[PDB]
Amino acid sequence: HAPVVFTLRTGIAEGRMVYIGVGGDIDHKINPTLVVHEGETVQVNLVNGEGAQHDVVVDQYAARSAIVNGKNASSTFSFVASKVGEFNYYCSIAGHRQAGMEGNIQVLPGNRAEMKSSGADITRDPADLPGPIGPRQAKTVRIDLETVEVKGQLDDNTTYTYWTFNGKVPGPFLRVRVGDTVELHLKNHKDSLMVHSVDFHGATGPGGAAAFTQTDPGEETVVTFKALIPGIYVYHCATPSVPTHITNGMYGLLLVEPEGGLPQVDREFYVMQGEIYTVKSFGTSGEQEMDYEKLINEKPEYFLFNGSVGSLTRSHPLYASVGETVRIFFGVGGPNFTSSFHVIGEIFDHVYSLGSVVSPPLIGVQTVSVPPGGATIVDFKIDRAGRYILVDHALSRLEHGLVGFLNVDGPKNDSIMHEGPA
């Protein structure tokens, strides 16, 4: 899947010079055992804790970090765990392994267990959206939203109180045609602590409907509005604190299609990016809580596609076939960060700049900047097989949970790309 990441700081613990695990299953453990599965790419982050000179060397794998001299100095490295077995990792600096700097890597056969937690699955499946609208004239379309607060799985062994539309993140993908009148019914579940509401960027008028949809727990609110302008629009809860309702999960997409629909495509996907601001650092397991200082000061701990870590890699990856033309509806709930959306190994044939559906799309684009509260549409033909990788190209975000897979079967080598010379 994605690399398994372990973080080690050096220091003095239990009477010796040692490595100490940070986060995951190794948190605060001295010389922790790093357990890994055959064929995984293993990444190790070494951070210098006390200021002596260190490295990490993996015995038999020829893998090592750079040497790290001062306090905080850091070195990151990886290796493919291709041989089952036990392998020491140790510091090669004179005396250090003897002083105590040594632990084990266990390469186990088989595949890593699925992620588990005591929380609900809150992920939107990227194939979970309505298809192109049929050959219909304009009508009144009824849409139902329900606002629900739920303990959700954020990561392996890690949970969070999400606030959602209809129990998943992003909310339901709404699809209407320009000229439609939308009759929106918003129920706020009676267990909710908060009032919830909705602001559609595709709606015209007070709060984009928020003025009409502030709904108490157990109540229902109804609003009707005309869809006047085609485009791909974000919607989100708009009860103060708005950035808090958004970071907790309350965002979704609304497509107002042009009269004759968007160009036809073999397959469509639904993806949104957001942030979560937890008291504890990324990778720390257990029950997570919002940290308001991190929220207001724009210091995220998690960056997420569709609600959770591994949402689009392990739980609900994207799948297509070679020769298919694919469309991604991509939006940023945020609340704060502009995404530099890229599919590793592919090129966008068409990009609907700033989510404009009326203007001609741009042609042949690697990466598209998408602001919080903004959406685009990207289309591309898949020419050949591979695992394509959805990322925000601010690539430090990879290591905060932001990565998605698009799986396409077929041969490794072909005329489009192959090993060896031409």
* Residues 334-373: x where in contact with Cu ion by CB under 5 A, - otherwise, as a string: ---------------------------------------x
Q: State which amino acid sits at residue 161.
A: T
CA distance 25 to 193: 33
- Is 350 marked within a binding site? no
Nearer to K ion, 100 or 386 (CB): 386
| Residue 383 binding target from its own copies, K ion, Cu ion, none, CB below 5 to 8 Å by type | K ion
Looking at beta carbons only, is 161 or 325 nearer to K ion? 325
Is residue 239 a contact residue for Cu ion (CB under 5 A)?
yes
- Say what the alpha-carbon torsion angle 298, 301, 306, 312 is, to the nearest 10 degrees: 140
Inter-residue contact 32 to 23 (CB < 8 Å): no
Our CB check for K ion shows the closer of 67 and 344 to be 344
Query: For residues 285 and 281, what is the distance between their CA atoms, to the nearest angstrom?
Result: 9
Q: Which of residues 325-364 bind its own copies (CB under 8 A)?
A: none
Rule CB under 5 A: say whether 22 interacts with Cu ion.
no
* Cβ atoms 207, 243 nearer than 8 A: no
SS3 (DSSP) at 242? helix
Listed in order, strand segments (DSSP E) in 314-358 are: 318-320, 325-334, 339-344, 348-351
Are the CB atoms for 224 and 183 separated by under 8 Å?
yes
10 Å CB burial of residue 136 (0-12, 13-18, 19+) is: exposed
- E strand or H helix that includes residue 155: strand 140-155
The mark string for 346-375 relative to K ion (x by CB under 5 A, - otherwise) is ------------------------------
Nearer to its own copies, 52 or 255 (CB): 52
In the chain, % helix, strand, coil (3-state, to 5) comes to 10, 45, 45
- The 232-251 site mask, x for binding its own copies (CB under 8 A), equals --------------------
Q: Quick check: 16 binds its own copies (CB under 8 A)?
A: yes
Residue 99 contact among K ion, Cu ion, its own copies, none, beta carbon within 5 to 8 Å by kind: its own copies
Residues 285-324 that bind Cu ion (CB under 5 A): none
Using CB under 8 A, pick the residue from 96, 196, 245, 350 that binds its own copies: 96
The answer to whether 250 is a known ligand-binding residue is yes
On whether 418 is known to bind a ligand per the annotation, the reply is no
With CB under 8 A as the contact rule, the residue among 51, 205, 207, 345 that binds its own copies is: 51
In the numeric block, which tokens belong to residue 347? Answer: 């090129």
Q: Return all residues near 20 (Cβ < 8 A) that are at least 6 apart.
A: 8, 9, 10, 11, 13, 28, 29, 30, 32, 49
Q: Is 30 in the site for its own copies (CB under 8 A)?
A: no
Q: Longest C-alpha distance within the chain, in Å?
A: 80
Among positions 33, 41, 43, 53, the unique one binding its own copies when judged by CB under 8 A = 53
Kindly tell me which of 98 and 321 has the beta carbon lying closer to its own copies. 98
Query: Contact with Cu ion (CB under 5 A): which of 2, 7, 48, 54?
Result: 54
Q: Does 324 bind K ion (CB under 5 A)?
A: no
Asked if residues 253 and 306 have their Cβ atoms less than 8 Å apart, the reply is no
236 annotated as ligand-binding: yes
Residue from 94, 113, 193, 422 touching its own copies (CB under 8 A): that is 94
Residues that bind K ion (CB under 5 A): 380-381, 383
